[PDB]
């Protein structure tokens, strides 16, 4: 703000409150912890190590002289509840949570996709620490071998902008991505590698026990069975996912 008639700096800073990325921060704070989702029990512990634990006690990492993890990269079957696992940690840590659908990026206006992801990353540093959930990496992961003449360079530009923000030259900002894909065959060698995504995690299909876990949560929202036997239920749902 400038006091007019001399038009010189008098007041820092009213800047800027930009709804375009400001408005995609917190999701009214998650009501999901990792006690309102299961089935991916084994995976959950791994994730708590990579994200929550630095925040819980930093000193355990300082103590072993190690860099703390950069978060987790999840692939698996669609719908297993990768979103809900990001939500579970974000809530529990009591840190800033930025949920972006990451496929809604990539504009057909050139490099606008890249611009936008530059803002979301910057936004993260200002409100650091912040955990960012980048959903869907099937429309922002580029292909280096041509298949769409106008397409390849465009998705690539966007992609290498966010990589640049991630640890290209610039600090992490204690992000801690937390970003879900389902294909590891559509990623580029550039992002695939760790130091951008330290612990690459396989998310498989739920075990026998895991069907059962998910089931008990959902039937407690219902009126529940009066002839309980969850062993039967598990068998049928074998070969499916958490969303099913």
């Amino acid at each position: 703000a400038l006091n007019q008639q001399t038009l010189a700096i008098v007041n820092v800073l009213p800047t800027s409150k930009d709804p375009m990325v400001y408005g995609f921060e917190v999701e009214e704070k998650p009501e999901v912890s990792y006690e309102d989702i299961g089935g991916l029990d084994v995976q959950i512990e791994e994730i708590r190590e990579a994200v929550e634990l630095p925040l819980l006690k930093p000193e355990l990492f300082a103590e072993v002289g190690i860099e703390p993890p950069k978060g987790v990269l999840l692939y698996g079957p669609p719908g297993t509840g990768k979103t809900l696992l990001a939500k579970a940690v974000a809530n529990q840590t009591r840190a800033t949570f930025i949920r972006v659908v990451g496929s809604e990026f990539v504009q057909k206006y050139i490099g606008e996709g890249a611009r936008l992801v530059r803002e979301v990353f910057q936004l993260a540093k200002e409100k650091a620490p912040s955990i960012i959930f980048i959903d869907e990496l099937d429309a922002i992961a580029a292909r280096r071998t041509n298949s769409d003449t106008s397409g390849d360079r465009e998705v690539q530009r966007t992609m290498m902008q966010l990589l640049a923000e991630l640890d290209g030259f610039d600090p992490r900002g204690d992000v801690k991505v937390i970003g879900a894909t389902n294909r590891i065959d559509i990623l580029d060698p550039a992002i695939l590698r760790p130091g951008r995504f330290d612990r690459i995690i396989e998310v498989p299909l739920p075990t026998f026990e895991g069907r059962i876990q998910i089931f008990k949560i959902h039937t407690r929202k219902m009126k529940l069975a009066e002839d309980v036997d969850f062993k039967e239920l598990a068998r049928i749902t074998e070969g499916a996912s958490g969303a099913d």
């Binding site: 006091n3 001399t6 038009l7 010189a8 700096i9 008098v10």
Partner: protein
């Protein structure tokens, strides 16, 4: 809080008759007075003054 306003603009051309046209960031083109702080010898058209 009162630091005077000094307009910033970029030189359009340098005149042979010992003057200079300079474009304000307001918009309107102006012919300015030379001075001995900054001469027409440190300046060229496009110089930010």
């Amino acid at each position: 809080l009162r630091s005077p306003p000094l307009l910033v603009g970029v030189v359009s051309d340098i005149l042979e008759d010992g003057r200079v046209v300079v474009k304000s960031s307001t918009g309107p083109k102006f012919v300015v007075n030379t001075s001995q702080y900054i001469n027409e010898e440190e300046l060229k058209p496009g110089a930010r003054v």
